[PDB]
């Protein structure tokens, strides 16, 4: 098992999950500032106020990146740190932080990949309806243009959006994520505008003529029938469209999946679109980012919901601390399917990783063998996909460091690096980081 010597091994983070400095240097409020400061939304009342304090500690963090030897670092930029009101006047100190960060990465021979939207919408824009207001799509594109202009010739890997399914449905249907709305109709309208805003930024990227590549990042969860039933097969197919095709088809085919679109429209009524929207959404892009963690096993169940389907708990299979099934085969299956059905463009795994109950020992080590076994098994499936002709160019581990795991707060640790929050926010390389270091040196698992 040996990867190409130029294969792009990396690690990933996001702004709200690591930066801290939540109201420092003119930064505006985000929907995740607001949400986490709302009682009962986050486990243990955790907030991202300080988190890993990467905003002040980023130089030390880049030293640790160099120790592991990652070739690329995927991070997101905070829209409200740069444009506090979401539009209007740039906050120069906020922008200067990312200019310093990128200069330091380039000096370290670490190739940056910027995610423009990793969920921290300006609260100023949420007060005008957030993603149900089509203007939010326009202002996102304007923010994209600013960033393209400022990092022309410095950043050549760009992702518009991280996981629009999650933003739409966890954020607005089930209310587990900011802004915390619980209305499925709103979630559909949101999804459309996220997709729209993506295409709008792609158009601007081409016009600005920067050197480099632009794409989008989707969480993809492959679905499997619980049984041989032709009804279990249709059920899994529908849930596969719910999560995956709902965003894959618009981006690569210029249409929503037909049956599911019908089902939604019949029960909820139509969400608002303008003519030509599917043309914008489906602009040609340069790569697809895939975030993969697990699968879903699905059985038919007429009653409970709109898809007449429920997900089966695989209780006799190993799982992570999140309760997610460990299922490395799913990473191969989804890479192969995307390449077969949707696109021949380069693919990146922009996230894969796992939470386990990490214990810091009585001097500074973390023996997270479960994480080593998890990543190893998934690296092997990526290799198999490669060998079978999938144009996989890179693999980013989630995460470079322990961080704020959204509604779970700091209770869930995904890092290669342990963050000892209470003790000066000090960092410790886990065994999995030492392991990943060996993999990258050799290009061999
Ligand atoms: O759940 C762990 C990670 O999963 C991915 O889907 C998200 O993009 C990350 O922000 C998240 O922390
Ligand atoms: C992606 As098209 C040309 O069918 O709108």
DSSP for 249-308, please give it: HHHHHSS--HHHHHHHHHHH-PPP--TTHHHHHT---SEEEEE----EEEEE-TTTSTTS
> Which atom of ligand 2 is least distant from the CA of 252?
1
What CATH number has the domain spanning 1-445?
A: 3.20.20.80
Question: From the CB of 278, is ligand 2 less than 6 Å away?
Answer: yes
Cα(303) to centroid(ligand 1), Å:
31
Residue pair 217/325 in contact by the 8 Å Cβ criterion:
no
Q: Nearest to residue 256, comparing CAs of 126, 171, 322, 164?
A: 164
Question: From the CB of 249, is ligand 2 less than 6 Å away?
Answer: no
Q: How is the chain split into domains, by residue range?
A: 1-445
Q: What angle do CA 371, 376, 381 make, to 5 degrees?
A: 130
User: For the chain, first and last CA: distance in Å?
Assistant: 6
Cα(200) to centroid(ligand 2), Å:
15
Question: And the tokens for 275?
Answer: 């003519």
Question: And the tokens for 216?
Answer: 């989008």
Residue pair 280/268 in contact by the 8 Å Cβ criterion:
no
Question: From the CB of 254, is ligand 2 less than 6 Å away?
Answer: yes
Cα(276) to centroid(ligand 1), Å:
32
Distances in whole angstroms, Cα of residue 439 to Cα of each of 372, 374, 379: 11, 14, 10
The CA distance from 440 to 19, in Å, is: 26
32 labelled ligand-binding: no
The CA distance from 229 to 147, in Å, is: 50
In the three-class reduction of DSSP (H, G, I as helix; E, B as strand; rest coil), residue 51 is classed as coil
The CA distance from 111 to 98, in Å, is: 14
Considering only CA atoms, which residue is closest to atom 1 of ligand 1?
Answer: 405
Q: State yes or no: is 19 an active-site residue.
A: no
Question: From the CB of 163, is ligand 1 less than 6 Å away?
Answer: yes
Is residue 7 classed exposed, middle or buried when 0-12, 13-18 and 19+ CB atoms within 10 A define those classes? middle
Q: How many residues does the chain have?
A: 445
Question: And the tokens for 441?
Answer: 């040196």
List Cβ neighbours of 270 (8 Å cut-off, separation of 6 or more). none
In the three-class reduction of DSSP (H, G, I as helix; E, B as strand; rest coil), residue 416 is classed as coil
Query: How is residue 408 annotated by DSSP?
Result: G
Residue pair 146/158 in contact by the 8 Å Cβ criterion:
no
List Cβ neighbours of 52 (8 Å cut-off, separation of 6 or more). 18, 19, 20, 61, 401, 402, 403, 419, 421, 425
Residue pair 405/176 in contact by the 8 Å Cβ criterion:
no
Residue pair 298/227 in contact by the 8 Å Cβ criterion:
no
Cα(36) to centroid(ligand 2), Å:
40
Q: How was this structure determined?
A: X-ray
The CA distance from 56 to 61, in Å, is: 10
Q: Nearest to residue 40, comparing CAs of 174, 168, 156, 180?
A: 180
Residue pair 150/113 in contact by the 8 Å Cβ criterion:
no
The CA distance from 436 to 29, in Å, is: 36
The number of the ligand nearest the C-alpha atom of 399 reads: 1
Tally of CB atoms within 10 A around 305: 11
Q: State yes or no: is 438 an active-site residue.
A: no
The number of the ligand nearest the C-alpha atom of 119 reads: 1
Pocket test for ligand 2, best of 257, 279, 285 (most atoms within 8 A of CB): 279
Considering only CA atoms, which residue is closest to atom 2 of ligand 2?
Answer: 254
Is residue 362 classed exposed, middle or buried when 0-12, 13-18 and 19+ CB atoms within 10 A define those classes? exposed
The CA distance from 260 to 309, in Å, is: 13
The number of the ligand nearest the C-alpha atom of 32 reads: 1
The CA distance from 360 to 418, in Å, is: 8
The CA distance from 171 to 164, in Å, is: 10
Residue pair 138/194 in contact by the 8 Å Cβ criterion:
no
Residue pair 374/382 in contact by the 8 Å Cβ criterion:
no
């Amino acid at each position: 098992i040996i990867f190409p010597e130029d294969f792009i091994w990396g690690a990933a983070t996001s702004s709200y999950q690591i930066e801290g400095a939540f109201n420092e240097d003119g930064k505006g409020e985000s929907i995740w500032d607001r949400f986490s400061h709302t009682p009962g939304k986050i486990e243990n009342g955790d907030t991202g106020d300080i988190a890993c304090d990467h905003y002040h500690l980023y130089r030390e963090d880049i030293e640790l990146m160099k120790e592991i030897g990652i070739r690329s670092y995927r991070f997101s930029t905070s829209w409200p740190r740069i444009l506090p009101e979401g539009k209007g006047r740039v906050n120069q100190k906020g922008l200067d932080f990312y200019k310093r960060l990128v200069d330091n990465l380039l000096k370290a021979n670490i190739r940056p990949m910027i995610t423009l939207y990793h969920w921290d919408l300006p609260q100023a824009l949420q007060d005008k309806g957030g993603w149900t207001n089509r203007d939010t799509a326009k202002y996102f594109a304007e923010y994209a243009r600013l960033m393209f202009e400022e990092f022309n010739g410095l950043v050549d890997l760009w992702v518009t959006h991280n996981e629009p399914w999650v933003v739409a449905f966890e954020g607005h249907a089930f209310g587990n994520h900011a802004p915390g709305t619980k209305d499925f109709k709103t979630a559909l309208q949101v999804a459309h505008h996220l997709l729209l805003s993506h295409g709008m930024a792609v158009d601007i990227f081409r016009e600005e003529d920067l050197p480099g590549e632009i794409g989008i990042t989707l969480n993809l969860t492959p679905a499997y029938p619980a049984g041989d039933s032709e009804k279990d097969v249709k059920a899994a197919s529908l849930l596969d469209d719910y999560i995956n095709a709902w965003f894959l088809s618009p981006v690569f085919k210029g249409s929503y999946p037909e049956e599911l679109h019908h089902i939604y429209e019949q029960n909820l009524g139509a969400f608002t679109t303008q003519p030509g929207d599917m043309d914008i959404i489906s602009r040609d892009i340069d790569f697809l980012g895939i975030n993969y963690y697990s699968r879903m096993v699905v059985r038919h169940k007429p009653g409970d919901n709109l898809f007449n389907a429920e997900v089966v708990k695989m209780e006799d299979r190993p799982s992570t601390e999140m309760g997610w099934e460990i299922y490395p085969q799913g990473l191969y299956d989804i890479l192969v399917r995307v390449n077969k059905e949707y696109t021949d463009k380069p693919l990146y795994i922009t996230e894969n990783g796992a939470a386990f109950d990490d214990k810091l020992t009585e001097e500074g080590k973390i023996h997270d063998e479960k994480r080593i076994n998890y990543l190893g098994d998934h690296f092997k499936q990526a290799y198999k996909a490669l060998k079978d002709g999938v144009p996989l160019r890179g693999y980013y581990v989630w995460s470079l460091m322990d961080n704020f795991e959204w509604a779970y707060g700091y209770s869930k640790r995904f890092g290669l690096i342990y963050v000892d929050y209470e003790n000066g926010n000090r960092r410790f390389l886990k065994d999995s980081a030492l392991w990943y270091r060996e993999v990258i040196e050799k290009g061999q698992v």
